[PDB]
Amino acid sequence: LDNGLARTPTMGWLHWERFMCNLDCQEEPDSCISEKLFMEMAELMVSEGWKDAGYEYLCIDDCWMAPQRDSEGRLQADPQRFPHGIRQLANYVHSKGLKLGIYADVGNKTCAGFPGSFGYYDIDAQTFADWGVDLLKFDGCYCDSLENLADGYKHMSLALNRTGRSIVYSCEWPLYMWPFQKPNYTEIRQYCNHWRNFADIDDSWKSIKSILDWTSFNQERIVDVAGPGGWNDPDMLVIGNFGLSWNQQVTQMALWAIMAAPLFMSNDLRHISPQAKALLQDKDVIAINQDPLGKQGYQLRQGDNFEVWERPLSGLAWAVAMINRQEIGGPRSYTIAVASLGKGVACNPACFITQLLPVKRKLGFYEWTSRLRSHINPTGTVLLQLENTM
Amino acid sequence: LDNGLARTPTMGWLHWERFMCNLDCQEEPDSCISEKLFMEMAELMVSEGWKDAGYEYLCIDDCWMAPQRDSEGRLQADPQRFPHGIRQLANYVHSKGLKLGIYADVGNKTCAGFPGSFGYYDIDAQTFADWGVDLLKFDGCYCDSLENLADGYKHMSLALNRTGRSIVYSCEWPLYMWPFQKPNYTEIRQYCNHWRNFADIDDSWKSIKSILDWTSFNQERIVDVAGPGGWNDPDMLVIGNFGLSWNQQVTQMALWAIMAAPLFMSNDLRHISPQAKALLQDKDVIAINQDPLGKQGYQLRQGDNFEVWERPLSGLAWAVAMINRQEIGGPRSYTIAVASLGKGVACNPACFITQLLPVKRKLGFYEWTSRLRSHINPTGTVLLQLENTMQM
Ligand SMILES: *[C@@H]1O[C@H](CO)[C@@H](O[C@@H]2O[C@H](CO)[C@@H](O[C@@H]3O[C@H](CO[C@H]4O[C@H](CO)[C@@H](O)[C@H](O)[C@@H]4O)[C@@H](O)[C@H](O[C@H]4O[C@H](CO)[C@@H](O)[C@H](O)[C@@H]4O)[C@@H]3O)[C@H](O)[C@H]2NC(C)=O)[C@H](O)[C@H]1NC(C)=O
Ligand SMILES: *[C@@H]1O[C@H](CO)[C@@H](O[C@@H]2O[C@H](CO)[C@@H](O[C@@H]3O[C@H](CO[C@H]4O[C@H](CO)[C@@H](O)[C@H](O)[C@@H]4O)[C@@H](O)[C@H](O[C@H]4O[C@H](CO)[C@@H](O)[C@H](O)[C@@H]4O)[C@@H]3O)[C@H](O)[C@H]2NC(C)=O)[C@H](O)[C@H]1NC(C)=O
Ligand SMILES: *[C@@H]1O[C@H](CO[C@@H]2O[C@@H](C)[C@@H](O)[C@@H](O)[C@@H]2O)[C@@H](O[C@@H]2O[C@H](CO)[C@@H](O)[C@H](O)[C@H]2NC(C)=O)[C@H](O)[C@H]1NC(C)=O
Ligand SMILES: *[C@@H]1O[C@H](CO[C@@H]2O[C@@H](C)[C@@H](O)[C@@H](O)[C@@H]2O)[C@@H](O[C@@H]2O[C@H](CO)[C@@H](O)[C@H](O)[C@H]2NC(C)=O)[C@H](O)[C@H]1NC(C)=O
Ligand SMILES: *[C@@H]1O[C@H](CO)[C@@H](O[C@@H]2O[C@H](CO)[C@@H](O)[C@H](O)[C@H]2NC(C)=O)[C@H](O)[C@H]1NC(C)=O
Ligand SMILES: *[C@@H]1O[C@H](CO)[C@@H](O)[C@H](O)[C@H]1NC(C)=O
Ligand SMILES: *[C@@H]1O[C@H](CO)[C@H](O)[C@H](O)C1(F)F
Ligand SMILES: *[C@@H]1O[C@H](CO)[C@H](O)[C@H](O)C1(F)F
Ligand SMILES: OC[C@H]1O[C@@H](O)[C@H](O)[C@@H](O)[C@@H]1O
């Protein structure tokens, strides 16, 4: 989407995976979907170095709305859970130097069953702009036709543009189209800043694997379309929660960087391990994800339960990820000719190789003739940066 | 098995999950199956508090054998990877105050393809005893005859007995019987100190779940056969490795305690986090596993992606484990009347409840009519100890 936004993949925090549709503020006041929750996260995004690391967008997902539209037929935030309204919340978020994301749905209802935007795209877009919203996630539930789907995503895209406010536009368009009809990505990109291709992530290694496998299986279709202003969205970062081992968290961070994926954390910033925090704030890894060239990486090799992925970067550099998919035994040895990496240019005549994950270590100079050798932990990833020596 | 051994579930370390059949000592010297690996593991068992915690048995799994038997028809340790032989390794292990486990197979080959013990049950038993072996794990590969399986397992049991040496006998008998007919556990219990019921564990939450679900699905068949001298074996502890989140590791430790499981760590004692070590050496949790009553626990309740398991303990005490099986969102509250716990006996007229996992916390006195309220992390377990009391 040519709106001057998402020139690098959007980075922020989104409530859905960790906090879901918790409306029980009586029994669970500290984790229900409320104005307070977003205030608390805003404060920590500043005080705990998240904004400094590039996480800029504080995003509301589903279950923020009142059950009905107001008298003027506009969306409204829940009167008890969001007693000050969205506009006021955006004022607060802005005063912290952050940006506010919100959520709506192309169909008749949101996925959790709250008011949909079908029939209201222009007023809903204007309402969002009026509130000072900076990002819209636009889900695809309760849409009865393939035609209504396309038209709705296009309509809303154009409606947000006419507001005059810069609003990042996140689309679930391809995901809800897929079962019926294969997406036209040139079309989607024309209308959307990023787009969800695959099923909702959850707090599990199974989930990470299936998303990786979905992406690599479909990489002929989706890799080349991605670029500044339009990204594939493999869903939220779930690092800092409950279901991933340390090595699996490293894999998600490493591969979301390879995939030039938007980085929306879904976690509890009030309760996060030092290790998870340092990985999520990893400067060198964020820098790969945020590479200004914006060329999405891809799976290069698969065999013997290893995967090799690579991504071209600015200034003749490359990122390389090596995953161990064998879920038994110990760290396994993997070797590859450096001449096989970066299409044969990364290390011609030579390259300097720095390992970034699981830990930062300079590996040294590698000749065109060289072989790269690593031990990779089960379900873990080794992430390397290669700098050509001119 | 009435040999006076495994009166509580056996505790130790077994190489298989973490090291498998790595024969490449040239290119993978640190993880290949060698005598140096076992020597070094023995040293760390002592120096790092593992033996103190109760982990006594250093166990060799598959892939220690030379390709062929010697001129006397006896098994031999691989000469390149075990140049000093098993006898000298057993000596080294005993001199650290530990015991040595070894591995063989009922069939013509071990699962990895090395010499089987069929036709050699008595000499192999004697060989191990001469070598100073204290435990035998006996696998079921390359034996496609139900009769030979049963006969070989029974024979090896009696063969070990006749050596006069105390040897823990670990059987994969019920697992390799599954494809043919349901196992007779009275028969197995008579011949074995513990027995593997289900497929090999690996380093994954998926594998933990499948083992738990297999156990609870089959509980009416396996729970009551367990007791001092004979345990169900749900396979190795894989805490300290790579594939389990902290909460998932807590789940395994807790539930292996509920199940009165043998505790065989399969990990690298040279490279293990302080958190995984603290969990594996948790004295209160180990005490539940090692409870003298030796009554296996069971799944009490299941629904809404929750599981409640409990185990009766010595002196009218109970362990209760609450599992959250929902793999999305955050901690979920679960409430239960304490009257429903411990067959209504644990907290009559009252009980003192101490949380053991994920952290140790005293929860206080609970009257028989009162309710217990917890929050459980996705894929995590809350482990509680209930002490029957007349007070408050
Ligand atoms: C509603 O929709 C319209 C149309 O899609 C959007 O308009 C686009 O807005 C973006 C960002 O403002 C424009 O991109 C910028 O254009 C500047 C000049 O462009 C000229 O040259 C191009 C050649 O391709 C012509 O198409 C165009 O007509 C102009 O003659 C550039 O100077 C900008 O450069 C930026 O990037 C460079 C390098 O990366 C940096 O040095 C600078 O910092 C700078 O930011 C940039 O390319 C785009 O041209 C507009 N398209 C059209 C067709 O007009 C609206 O933004 C949108 N409105 C809202 C509110 O969403
Ligand atoms: C080869 O196979 C044989 C046959 O199984 C094994 O011999 C058995 O060994 C066990 C364990 O050593 C013996 O069990 C012991 O029995 C003794 C009781 O004998 C009498 O007295 C008691 C009263 O106390 C009566 O109840 C009973 O009916 C008898 O009349 C006890 O002294 C032992 O108890 C102690 O240890 C046990 C743990 O095993 C504790 O629970 C007790 O509290 C106590 O401390 C014990 O129970 C059994 O009798 C033997 N069976 C036979 C048929 O002889 C060999 O051990 C085995 N050889 C090997 C593998 O080395
Ligand atoms: C949103 O819903 C409207 C309203 O009709 C609904 O759908 C019907 C099939 C039935 O379930 C009713 O109870 C609902 O109220 C949809 O508009 C209708 O569309 C159909 C064809 O799709 C058309 O024949 C009718 O003229 C429409 N009805 C009205 C009231 O105008 C609309 O398609 C839905 N939008 C999306 C994106 O799902
Ligand atoms: C272990 O193997 C022996 C040897 O026989 C082998 O297996 C046969 C099926 C055949 O493929 C031969 O070429 C192999 O050498 C088995 O002992 C035999 O048992 C069969 C009964 O099936 C009997 O007819 C033969 O007389 C036996 N042969 C000998 C050498 O005594 C034995 O069954 C195998 N043991 C186990 C536990 O599976
Ligand atoms: C995929 O969608 C794109 C955009 O809607 C289509 O590209 C347009 O094609 C028409 C002619 O058919 C041209 O007039 C435009 O210049 C194109 N626009 C863009 C953005 O390049 C394309 O036709 C579609 N492809 C398929 C296979 O349906
Ligand atoms: C179980 O097997 C043993 C054989 O040792 C036998 O005593 C018993 O009757 C068997 N039980 C059943 C139900 O077959
Ligand atoms: C849409 O459904 C839910 C919201 O109910 C969630 O936002 C998910 O990621 C979705 F697919 F975008
Ligand atoms: C038998 O197979 C392997 C050895 O190759 C391993 O020991 C496993 O746990 C088994 F099932 F006992
Ligand atoms: O489902 C609960 C039941 O499970 C059995 O296996 C156990 O032996 C019983 O004591 C228990 O009441």
Curated annotation (Swiss-Prot), chain A:
Pfam families found in the cross-reference section: Melibiase_2, Melibiase_2_C
Q: Per UniProt, what does mutating G330R do?
A: In FD; severe
The UniProt entry, under InterPro entries, shows: Aldolase_TIM, Glyco_hydro_27, Glyco_hydro_27/36_CS, Glyco_hydro_b, Glycoside_hydrolase_SF, Melibiase/NAGA_C
Provide the disulphide bond pattern.
C21-C63, C25-C32, C111-C141, C171-C192, C347-C351
* Stated consequence of mutating P29L: In FD; uncertain significance; decreased enzyme activity
In alphabetical order, the GO MF annotations are: alpha-galactosidase activity; catalytic activity; hydrolase activity; protein homodimerization activity; signaling receptor binding
Q: What is this protein called?
A: Alpha-galactosidase A
Organism annotation: Homo sapiens (Human)
Lineage, opening ranks: Eukaryota, Metazoa, Chordata, Craniata, Vertebrata
Gene that this polypeptide is encoded by = GLA
